[PDB]
UniProtKB/Swiss-Prot annotation:
Keyword Hydrolase: yes
EC number(s) given by UniProt: 3.5.2.6
Function summary: Extended-spectrum beta-lactamase (ESBL) which confers resistance to penicillins, as well as first, second, third and fourth-generation cephalosporins. Has ceftazidime-hydrolyzing activity. Inactive against the carbapenems, imipenem, meropenem, ertapenem and doripenem. However, weak hydrolytic activity with respect to imipenem has also been reported.
Subunit structure: Monomer. May form dimers.
Protein name, entry field: Beta-lactamase GES-1
GO term, biological process aspect, one: response to antibiotic
Alphabetical UniProt keywords: Antibiotic resistance, Disulfide bond, Hydrolase, Plasmid, Signal
Note: The class A beta-lactamase family has a specific amino-acid numbering system, sometimes called Ambler or ABL numbering and often misspelt as Amber. A multiple sequence alignment was used to derive a consensus sequence and then the consensus was numbered taking into account insertions and deletions. This allows use of identical numbers, e.g. for active site residues, despite differences in protein length. UniProt always uses natural numbering of residues, hence there appear to be differences in numbering between this entry and some papers.
Encoding gene per record: ges-1
Record-linked InterPro entries: Beta-lactam/transpept-like (IPR012338), Beta-lactam_cat (IPR045155), Beta-lactam_class-A (IPR000871)
GO molecular function annotations of the record: beta-lactamase activity
Amino-acid positions noted as binding a beta-lactam in the UniProt annotation, renumbered to this chain: 50, 108, 144, 215
Pfam families: Beta-lactamase2 (PF13354)
Length: 269
């Protein structure tokens, strides 16, 4: 209670001084709440949905309705803003399911994400997967990049911190995927290339951390994932809205939230 009050007060200070709204949820591996802030306020998911999308793909691999080495053909029509791996593989004419999923998770590659969405039935099928694993909140309505428009008040392409944190825990800890598929996605999250300056920059350097970032128009900056601290496993979701901050200052904001999280966790002994 005392620690939870410091958590709240310190996030409210960041919110007030950075003119930002901060949504956080921390859950244990079974989805029980450790701490939260605006945890049931809706925020645009931005690229954070690419981690659940990968989980959906591995579920189809686990079930035999997809194969990771299946070649997904495409042309230049699939290149959109921020498609670094898709652009590199374009001349070869395809990416495999697994290549696309790894680029979506680790580089946030939009073309690779849309390639997978083409294959699994689109935003509706992403939403259906959320519902299947117990998430009645998260919804994908659009492909990239327009799903990141983050029009104020729009409930399309949103989640809440608590719903997403519980989805992360379900995927990583609650048996949604085989051990092999779970480990593959865990390692992709640890080796993510886009999160060096966000949440994991605010955590102690010996905590094992893996996460997926998101950036939206109108000041969305998010980071979801998992961390292992003091031999305890957690799932975490951070969504922020800071319209007036610079991109670097939003990075710093999420890292600061990581520090506030750390101080709560360390006050469990």
């Amino acid at each position: 209670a005392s620690e939870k009050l410091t958590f709240k007060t310190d996030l409210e200070k960041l919110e007030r001084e950075k003119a930002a709204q901060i949504g956080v949820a921390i859950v244990d591996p079974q989805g029980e709440i450790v701490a939260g802030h605006r945890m049931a306020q809706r925020f645009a998911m931005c690229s954070t949905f690419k981690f659940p999308l990968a989980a959906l793909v591995f579920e189809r691999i686990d079930s035999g309705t997809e194969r990771g080495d299946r070649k997904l053909s495409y042309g230049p029509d699939m290149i959109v803003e921020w498609s670094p791996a898709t652009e590199r593989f374009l001349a070869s004419g395809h990416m495999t399911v697994l290549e696309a999923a790894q680029a979506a998770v680790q580089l946030s590659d939009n073309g690779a994400t849309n390639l997978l969405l083409r294959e699994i039935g689109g935003p509706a099928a992403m939403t259906q997967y959320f519902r299947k694993i117990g998430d009645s909140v998260s919804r994908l309505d659009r492909k990239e990049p327009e799903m990141g428009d983050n029009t104020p008040g729009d409930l399309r392409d949103t989640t809440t911190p608590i719903a997403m944190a519980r989805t992360v825990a379900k995927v990583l800890y609650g048996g949604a995927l085989t051990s092999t598929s779970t480990h593959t996605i865990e390692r992709w999250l640890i080796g993510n290339q886009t999160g060096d300056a966000t949440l994991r920059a605010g955590f102690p350097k010996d905590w094992v951390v893996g996460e997926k970032t998101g950036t939206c128009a109108n000041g969305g900056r998010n980071d979801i994932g998992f961390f292992k601290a003091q031999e305890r496993d957690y799932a975490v979701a951070v969504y922020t809205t800071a319209p007036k901050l610079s991109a670097v200052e939003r990075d710093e904001l999420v890292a600061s939230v990581g520090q506030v999280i750390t101080q709560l966790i360390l006050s469990t002994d």
